[PDB]
């Protein structure tokens, strides 16, 4: 009868370059999913999507043999349950129910699925009073993604499992502490769901791949991280966010709707930039407490969803 509240995730810099051996600066954020699990004693497992008011019942002996992509919206949580079980080498004797509710917008690079996954792993393990190291959990999440999508990157799962700010390169991460982590504990950001993403993330990767100037852009993108890593004030940091945005714009994966949002961000805030693959999605804005009230009014005058969020630590 525990309740797991799993963090969300956002890329501060590195969006598409990471894919080419460059670095990604990922940060865990307040937007959480909440998964509650409780034994039932009916002889089956029940999954319930509150936000979508959907429900599913399965027998304890179908669990390990079901195929995730046969269950639409329940697939990630479902898959997280199956893997945690055989990983713990446990065979469900008794039943239980899981209630799922996330606040995190879907398909816009915030790690909506991974949050559900990481919270299901922690839930099922704890329900059996067997705990896993962040190391085991991160991998179980990564495998759930790989199993469902065919492939996966550690970014979402590692970021959401280890919390804080991570540096992603190739396929390994580097935790970031010091002044940079300190400075971020001091920043209030805003995730603005400008528009929906009518395109698939791989589809955008291909559109970035089909660019000549791409590499020279990635290099400028990496020099921005060099500088970002060493920045001290939100004024300087904001602009660096805006600059990375101007670069992503050179990969024409940005949109007129995102640019508008970014504008409001540079003017009424400290700077702004889209996050994740382009073609719609969210724009992350570093809040300027000074004009914060302003920022809102202007942003609110738009067909968008906004979310107050700060970094998430351990």
CB-neighbour burial class of residue 98 (10 A; exposed 0-12, middle 13-18, buried 19+): buried
**Residues 173 and 230 occupy one common structural domain:** no
**Residues 139 and 203 occupy one common structural domain:** no
The token duo for 36 is 């509650």
Three-class secondary structure assignment of 17-63: HHHHCCEEEEEEEEEEEEEEEEECCCCEEEEEECCCCEEEEEECCCH
- Does residue 314 form part of some domain? no
**Residues 25 and 160 occupy one common structural domain:** yes
**Residues 114 and 199 occupy one common structural domain:** no
**Residues 126 and 26 occupy one common structural domain:** yes
- Does residue 195 form part of some domain? yes
| Residue 105 is assigned to a ligand binding site | yes
* Residue 178 near residue 171, CB atoms below 8 Å: no
**Residues 196 and 219 occupy one common structural domain:** yes
Q: Facing residues of 183 across strands?
A: none
The token duo for 285 is 């804005």
**Residues 22 and 120 occupy one common structural domain:** yes
Best CA proximity match to 157, nearest among 118, 107, 104 = 118
**Residues 44 and 93 occupy one common structural domain:** yes
Best CA proximity match to 117, nearest among 153, 69, 83 = 83
Residues 6+ apart with CB under 8 A from 307: 31, 103, 105, 190, 191, 192, 193
Residue 86 is among the residues annotated as catalytic for this protein: no
**Residues 194 and 149 occupy one common structural domain:** no
Which of 123, 145, 177 marks a domain boundary?
A: 177
| Residue 1 is assigned to a ligand binding site | no
* Residue 158 near residue 142, CB atoms below 8 Å: yes
Instruction: Report the CATH number at residue 204.
Output: 3.30.70.890
- Does residue 75 form part of some domain? yes
What one-character-per-residue DSSP string does 298-313 give?
HHHTSS-EEEEE-B--
Please report the resolution in angstroms: 2.7
Alpha-carbon distance of 290 to 304, in angstroms, equals 22
* Residue 35 near residue 4, CB atoms below 8 Å: yes
Alpha-carbon distance of 238 to 240, in angstroms, equals 5
**Residues 182 and 244 occupy one common structural domain:** yes
| Residue 254 is assigned to a ligand binding site | no
Domain count for the chain, please give it.
Answer: 2
Q: How far does Cα 23 stand from its chain's mean position?
A: 17
The token duo for 269 is 């805030």
Domain housing 12: 2-177
- Does residue 182 form part of some domain? yes
Which of 148, 177, 206 marks a domain boundary?
A: 177
| Residue 272 is assigned to a ligand binding site | no
Residue with tokens 């799993």: 6
Instruction: Report the CATH number at residue 44.
Output: 3.30.230.10
- 249, 255, 260, 265 alpha-carbon torsion, rounded to 10°: -50
**How many other C-beta atoms can be found within 10 angstroms of the C-beta atom of residue 301?**
9
What is the three-class DSSP state of 106?
coil
What is the three-class DSSP state of 96?
strand
Measuring CA to CA, how many Å separate 4 from each of 52, 102, 228? Answer: 19, 11, 33
Alpha-carbon distance of 17 to 39, in angstroms, equals 45
Measuring CA to CA, how many Å separate 203 from each of 132, 198, 208, 210, 249? Answer: 35, 10, 9, 11, 17
**How many other C-beta atoms can be found within 10 angstroms of the C-beta atom of residue 49?**
19
Choice among 30, 51, 156, 303 that is catalytic = 156
Which of 122, 153, 177 marks a domain boundary?
A: 177
**Residues 19 and 36 occupy one common structural domain:** yes
- Does residue 299 form part of some domain? yes
| Residue 55 is assigned to a ligand binding site | no
Alpha-carbon distance of 202 to 187, in angstroms, equals 31
CB-neighbour burial class of residue 314 (10 A; exposed 0-12, middle 13-18, buried 19+): exposed
- Does residue 234 form part of some domain? yes
Provide the H-helix boundaries in 234-291: 234-249, 256-268
Residue with tokens 């719609």: 280
Measuring CA to CA, how many Å separate 97 from each of 57, 78, 153, 219? Answer: 9, 12, 30, 49
In the sheet with 271-275, reading across from the earlier edge strand, the strands are: 271-275, 281-286, 189-195, 305-309
Burial 251-270 (b: 16+ CB within 10 A, else e): bebbbebbbebbebbbebbb
The radius of gyration of the chain's CA atoms, rounded to the nearest angstrom, is: 20
Q: What is the number of residues in the chain?
A: 314
- Does residue 313 form part of some domain? no
**Residues 24 and 101 occupy one common structural domain:** yes
């Amino acid at each position: 009868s525990l309740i797991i509240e799993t963090p969300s995730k956002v890329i501060l810099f590195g969006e598409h370059a990471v894919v080419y051996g460059y670095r990604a600066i990922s940060m865990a954020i307040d937007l959480t999913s909440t998964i509650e699990i409780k034994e039932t004693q009916e002889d089956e497992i029940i999954l319930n999507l509150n936000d979508l008011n959907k429900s599913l019942g399965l027998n304890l002996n179908e669990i390990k043999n079901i195929n995730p992509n046969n269950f639409g919206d329940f697939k990630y949580c479902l898959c997280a349950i199956k893997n945690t079980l055989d990983y713990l080498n446990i065979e469900p004797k008794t039943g239980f129910k899981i209630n799922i509710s996330s606040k995190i917008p879907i398909s816009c690079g915030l790690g909506s699925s991974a949050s559900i996954t990481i919270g299901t792993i922690k839930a099922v393990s704890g329900f059996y009073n067997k705990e896993l190291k962040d190391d085991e959990i991160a991998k179980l999440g990564y495998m759930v993604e790989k199993e469902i999508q065919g492939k996966a990157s550690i970014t979402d799962t590692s970021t959401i499992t280890y919390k804080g700010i991570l540096e992603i390169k190739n396929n390994k991460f580097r935790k970031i502490k010091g002044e940079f982590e300190e400075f971020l504990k001091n920043c209030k950001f805003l995730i603005v769901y400008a528009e929906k993403r009518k395109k698939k993330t791989a589809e955008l990767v291909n559109e970035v791949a089909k660019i000549e100037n791409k590499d020279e852009i990635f290099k400028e993108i990496d020099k921005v991280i060099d500088e970002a890593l060493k920045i001290k004030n939100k004024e300087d940091f904001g602009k660096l966010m805006t600059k990375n945005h101007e670069l992503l714009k050179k990969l024409n994966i940005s949109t007129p709707k995102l640019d508008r949002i970014v504008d409001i961000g540079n003017r009424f805030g400290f700077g702004a930039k889209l996050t994740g693959a382009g073609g719609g999605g969210c724009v992350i804005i570093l809040v300027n407490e000074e004009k914060e009230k302003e920022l809102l009014k202007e942003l609110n005058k738009e067909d968008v969803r906004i979310f107050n969020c700060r970094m998430m630590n351990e």
